Amino acid sequence: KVRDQEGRMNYYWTLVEPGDKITFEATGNLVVPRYAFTMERDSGIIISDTPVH
């Protein structure tokens, strides 16, 4: 038990190309998407406590 939960939830992600389709099928146990993110790639992740100015 972590965070007072006995079960788990696995998170998956995918990229859909232009002109391509994503298909979902489920008899259960599905956490469906509600918001998707249109992105155009390209420059890192910095872990710091420094304020942004």
Using CB under 8 A as the criterion, which residues of the chain lie in contact with other proteins when the complex forms? 43-46
28-33 long-range contacts, Cβ below 8 Å, gap at least 24? none
Q: How far is the CB of 42 from other proteins (least distance, A)?
A: 10
Tokens 């249109």 correspond to what residue? Answer: 38
Closer residue to other proteins (CB): 39 or 46: 46
Q: How far is the CB of 48 from other proteins (least distance, A)?
A: 11
Closer residue to other proteins (CB): 23 or 43: 43
Among residues 33, 9, 10, the alpha carbon closest in space to that of 23 is found at: 33
